[PDB]
Scaffold this motif. Structure first.
Motif, short mmCIF file in Angstrom:
data_model
loop_
_atom_site.label_atom_id
_atom_site.label_comp_id
_atom_site.label_asym_id
_atom_site.label_seq_id
_atom_site.Cartn_x
_atom_site.Cartn_y
_atom_site.Cartn_z
N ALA A 13 0.82 -1.21 0.00
CA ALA A 13 0.00 0.00 0.00
C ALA A 13 0.85 1.27 0.00
O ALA A 13 0.50 2.27 -0.64
CB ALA A 13 -0.95 0.01 1.22
N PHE A 16 2.28 1.86 -3.40
CA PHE A 16 1.23 2.45 -4.24
C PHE A 16 1.03 3.95 -3.99
O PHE A 16 0.95 4.75 -4.93
CB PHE A 16 -0.10 1.74 -4.05
CG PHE A 16 -1.19 2.40 -4.80
CD1 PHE A 16 -1.28 2.23 -6.18
CD2 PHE A 16 -2.08 3.27 -4.16
CE1 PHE A 16 -2.24 2.88 -6.90
CE2 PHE A 16 -3.05 3.92 -4.88
CZ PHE A 16 -3.14 3.72 -6.26
N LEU A 20 2.03 7.75 -6.53
CA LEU A 20 1.28 8.98 -6.82
C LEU A 20 2.14 10.25 -6.81
O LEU A 20 1.66 11.33 -7.19
CB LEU A 20 0.16 9.14 -5.79
CG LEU A 20 -0.83 7.96 -5.80
CD1 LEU A 20 -1.74 7.96 -4.58
CD2 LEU A 20 -1.65 8.02 -7.08
N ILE A 56 1.21 -7.70 -5.03
CA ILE A 56 0.10 -6.91 -4.53
C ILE A 56 0.15 -5.45 -4.99
O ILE A 56 -0.87 -4.89 -5.35
CB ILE A 56 0.07 -6.98 -3.03
CG1 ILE A 56 -0.25 -8.43 -2.60
CG2 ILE A 56 -0.95 -5.97 -2.44
CD1 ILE A 56 0.02 -8.71 -1.10
N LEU A 60 -2.66 -3.53 -7.21
CA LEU A 60 -3.20 -2.24 -6.81
C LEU A 60 -3.08 -1.22 -7.93
O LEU A 60 -4.03 -0.53 -8.25
CB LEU A 60 -2.48 -1.67 -5.57
CG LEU A 60 -2.71 -2.12 -4.13
CD1 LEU A 60 -2.15 -3.50 -3.79
CD2 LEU A 60 -2.05 -1.14 -3.19
N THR A 64 -6.75 0.23 -9.56
CA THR A 64 -7.10 1.61 -9.28
C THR A 64 -7.05 2.51 -10.51
O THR A 64 -7.29 3.70 -10.37
CB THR A 64 -6.13 2.19 -8.24
OG1 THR A 64 -4.80 2.11 -8.74
CG2 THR A 64 -6.23 1.39 -6.93
N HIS A 66 -4.24 3.19 -12.17
CA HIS A 66 -2.95 3.90 -12.24
C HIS A 66 -1.91 3.24 -13.16
O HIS A 66 -0.91 3.85 -13.46
CB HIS A 66 -2.42 4.20 -10.84
CG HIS A 66 -3.18 5.30 -10.15
ND1 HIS A 66 -2.79 6.62 -10.19
CD2 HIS A 66 -4.39 5.29 -9.53
CE1 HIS A 66 -3.69 7.37 -9.58
NE2 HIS A 66 -4.66 6.58 -9.16
#
Ligand SMILES: CCCCCCCCCO[C@@H]1O[C@H](CO)[C@@H](O)[C@H](O)[C@H]1O
Ligand SMILES: CCCCCCCCCO[C@@H]1O[C@H](CO)[C@@H](O)[C@H](O)[C@H]1O
Ligand SMILES: CCCCCCCCCO[C@H]1O[C@@H](CO)[C@H](O)[C@@H](O)[C@@H]1O
Ligand SMILES: Cc1ncc(C[n+]2csc(CCO)c2C)c(N)n1
Length: 176
Positions: A13, A16, A20, A56, A60, A64, A66
């Motif tokens: 997470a 991920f 951004l 994972i 993700l 999402t 992305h």
């Protein structure tokens, strides 16, 4: 059991969330700082943990919206195999004191080189319509992905050297 799984999950997470952060130097020459959490995970918990972390993270990115997807096989290569391959850092896990910096650096070198090797292969197959004027498929992909891979290695080296000096506990798992 629950410790290991929560760590795999939190590091995926975090990879991920870090992806951004704007990270483009020019077109697809990028500084992929999101690798770092998966490198940390693999170095601390070993090959299998890191593989699963990268899997994972890749999932993700795709679910999402992305991920940059051109086909099924391209997505497989760049968002499954490539992030998973970062787990190779885990072969350099240090199980016992004292923590040395060299394994951390070698693990990182090898894992980032492997990831960007898969991006290089993908660049030749799927991205050559963007090649700079006068550049063939191989040459263009080697530049773009070679450069990104070097920059990503740089960023990972800098962060991980800082963590080794300031948070060495991160790199060696202990029960107790
Ligand atoms: C297996 C454990 C999974 C945990 C992952 C939870 C964190 C992912 C949240 O991503 C969010 O996705 C949105 C899409 O709706 C984006 O708009 C937003 O920018 C981004 O913050
Ligand atoms: C280049 C891709 C494939 C190379 C994989 C070979 C790595 C060998 C890892 O063994 C070593 O074992 C020591 C004792 O357990 C560890 O402390 C050390 O840090 C670790 O490095
Ligand atoms: C992040 C930078 C990406 C690294 C790109 C370097 C590509 C080097 C390829 O290694 C190689 O492995 C052997 C089998 O795979 C081949 O027989 C050999 O000819 C080939 O060259
Ligand atoms: C020449 C060239 N251009 C674009 C890509 C695609 N790409 C590069 S790094 C990456 C993952 C970052 O999320 C992706 C999808 C490539 N491989 N090679």
């Amino acid at each position: 059991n629950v410790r290991l799984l929560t760590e795999i999950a939190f590091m995926a997470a975090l990879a991920f969330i870090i992806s951004l952060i704007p990270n483009t130097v020019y077109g697809w020459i990028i500084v992929e700082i999101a690798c770092i959490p998966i490198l940390l995970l693999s170095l601390r918990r070993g090959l299998t943990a890191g593989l699963v972390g990268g899997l994972i993270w890749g999932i993700l990115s795709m679910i999402t919206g992305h991920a940059y997807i051109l086909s099924l096989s391209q997505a497989f290569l760049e968002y499954l195999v490539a992030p998973v391959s970062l787990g190779i850092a885990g072969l350099f896990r240090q199980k016992t004191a004292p923590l040395k910096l060299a394994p951390v650096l070698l693990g990182t070198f090898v894992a980032v080189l492997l990831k960007y090797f898969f991006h290089f292969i993908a660049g030749i197959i799927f991205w050559s319509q963007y090649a700079w004027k006068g550049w063939g498929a191989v040459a263009y992909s080697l530049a773009v992905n070679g450069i990104s891979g070097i920059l990503t290695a740089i960023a990972a080296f800098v962060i991980l050297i800082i963590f080794v000096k300031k948070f060495p506990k991160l790199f060696i798992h202990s029960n107790y």
